[PDB]
Design a binder for this molecule. Structure first.
Ligand SMILES: C=CC(C)(C)OC[C@H]1O[C@H](O[C@@H]2C3=C([C@H](C)CNC(=O)C4CC4)C[C@H](O)[C@]3(C)/C=C3/[C@@H](COC)CC[C@H]3[C@@H](C)[C@H]2O)[C@H](O)[C@@H](O)[C@@H]1O
Ligand SMILES: C=CC(C)(C)OC[C@H]1O[C@H](O[C@@H]2C3=C([C@H](C)CNC(=O)C4CC4)C[C@H](O)[C@]3(C)/C=C3/[C@@H](COC)CC[C@H]3[C@@H](C)[C@H]2O)[C@H](O)[C@@H](O)[C@@H]1O
Ligand SMILES: [Cl-]
Ligand SMILES: [Cl-]
Ligand code: NA
Ligand code: NA
Ligand code: NA
Ligand code: NA
Lengths: 231, 231
């Protein structure tokens, strides 16, 4: 790989610089290089990995949605193949990034993660990137099943090993509920998961750390925001 | 080039789609392909070209400024070569984009542009991209002279052939005044140019078209904003 000649510590340092400069493609490349050094990632390093790729795919998803919207309208004046072609171009790029992330998770990170915090983190990521693949799929069924199984394994571990207000547990439940509502045609499951997650976190807030209070209350607010939209 | 197999009209269509999707790197590549078909660009097509590359280089400049700021602080604890290396990486990418734009202007567009509107537009772009090169240069003098000479030729034509409220004339004067203030160590020239430009546009506003009123009043407001900051 192009990062093979750079020190692991230098890759981490440059990932943090790329984050400050909002250079997320660079940031992802540095963190991919770090993962490929073969050592486990720390808590801080996992966050760098997830933020980098979340921002890269987030821009691709937003662009794909704009183009798909134009395409669907155009099939409601004929203007030729260009809209479809360019949507397909963005879609292929998006799929390539998802495949890259899923490859890192499957080749390096999930196998070696034993602590609940790392294992749930990586399984959530796996569910997230299969979900992004599902959004553009038309073996959609197989991709949806892959996302569900990854989220479900993460859920089983998080409920057994983490308190209800743990930010990773909360963010996993948020995204799994969105999967149910938006992807899997299961709005009732989505609502039930979001409500039980929120309610159980409320009663646990008297154990929540000052250092994670900001993250967890934010995610709790996103759960409430979705419940208000869905009900 | 990679766009050589695509119809000119398809490249223009996809540039407009890329703009709607905020995919400016794609947008620039499509417009570069269009320019390389060898035909002159229309007014609308020139705007697509300039917006695409302005957004690409704008993100590079913002990232370069963040990294340079970190670098300059670090030379006020030693942390090794990484900040300099990554700043150099972004800088080289930025210079490559500027060189690409300047190459398109010099190989295709400036020679064939005879109408005042196209010729002033392209000469302004030439000044702009030399200015972006000057911001990171440490043959800085030669680059600064190249920007000044391009802006000056554009200024001479615009005052001879365009009314004072023409948006291209106004935007050229805005950017040349910023060049004087920020690049060329000539704040008094910057202030004088901005003030005479603003004053002469005010007295011409009774000829300004309804269709260009929005563009010109916007640029006039930017001139006033700079005058307020500078005085
Ligand atoms: C490594 C350095 C950097 C700067 C990149 O870290 C970024 C953040 O990383 C931790 O937050 C993570 C985190 C957040 C929280 C919600 C950000 N909170 C706020 O906006 C509060 C208002 C102030 C969103 C991210 O996408 C990130 C890394 C991702 C996930 C997500 C990861 O699923 C695989 C599960 C939940 C959340 C969990 C993992 C959260 O714990 C820190 O705690 C935060 O301070 C910090 O901003
Ligand atoms: C081709 C399609 C697209 C959508 C890309 O066009 C974009 C714009 O292109 C023309 O505006 C150009 C223009 C603008 C104006 C100021 C945008 N105005 C507003 O925000 C008003 C509040 C509503 C900034 C750009 O960077 C662009 C293309 C660039 C320049 C600049 C080019 O130096 C080489 C000189 C001035 C300005 C001149 C050239 C202006 O005329 C239109 O008139 C605008 O409607 C339109 O938004
Ligand atoms: Cl395409
Ligand atoms: Cl680097
Ligand atoms: Na090493
Ligand atoms: Na077409
Ligand atoms: Na043709
Ligand atoms: Na270092």
């Amino acid at each position: 790989g192009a990062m093979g000649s750079m020190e692991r510590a230098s890759l981490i340092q440059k990932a943090k610089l790329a984050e400050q400069a909002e250079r997320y493609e660079d940031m992802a490349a540095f963190m991919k290089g770090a993962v490929e050094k073969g050592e486990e990632l720390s808590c801080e390093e996992r966050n760098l990995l997830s933020v980098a790729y979340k921002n890269v795919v987030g821009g691709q998803r937003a662009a794909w949605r704009v183009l798909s919207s134009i395409e669907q309208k155009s099939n409601e004046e004929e203007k030729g193949p260009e809209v479809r072609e360019y949507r397909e171009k963005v879609e292929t790029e998006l799929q390539g990034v998802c495949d890259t992330v899923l490859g890192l998770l499957d080749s390096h990170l999930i196998k070696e993660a034993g602590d609940a915090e790392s294992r749930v983190f990586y399984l959530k990521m796996k569910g997230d990137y299969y979900r992004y693949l599902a959004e553009v799929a038309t073996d959609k069924k197989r991709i949806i099943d892959s996302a569900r199984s990854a989220y479900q394994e993460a859920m089983d571990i998080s409920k057994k090993e983490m308190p209800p207000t743990n930010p990773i547990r909360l963010g996993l439940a948020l995204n799994f509920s969105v999967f149910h509502y938006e992807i899997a045609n299961s709005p009732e499951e989505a609502i039930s998961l979001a409500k039980t997650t929120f309610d159980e976190a409320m009663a646990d807030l008297h154990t929540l750390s000052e250092d994670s209070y900001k993250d967890s209350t934010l995610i709790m607010q996103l759960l409430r925001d979705n419940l208000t939209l869905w009900t």
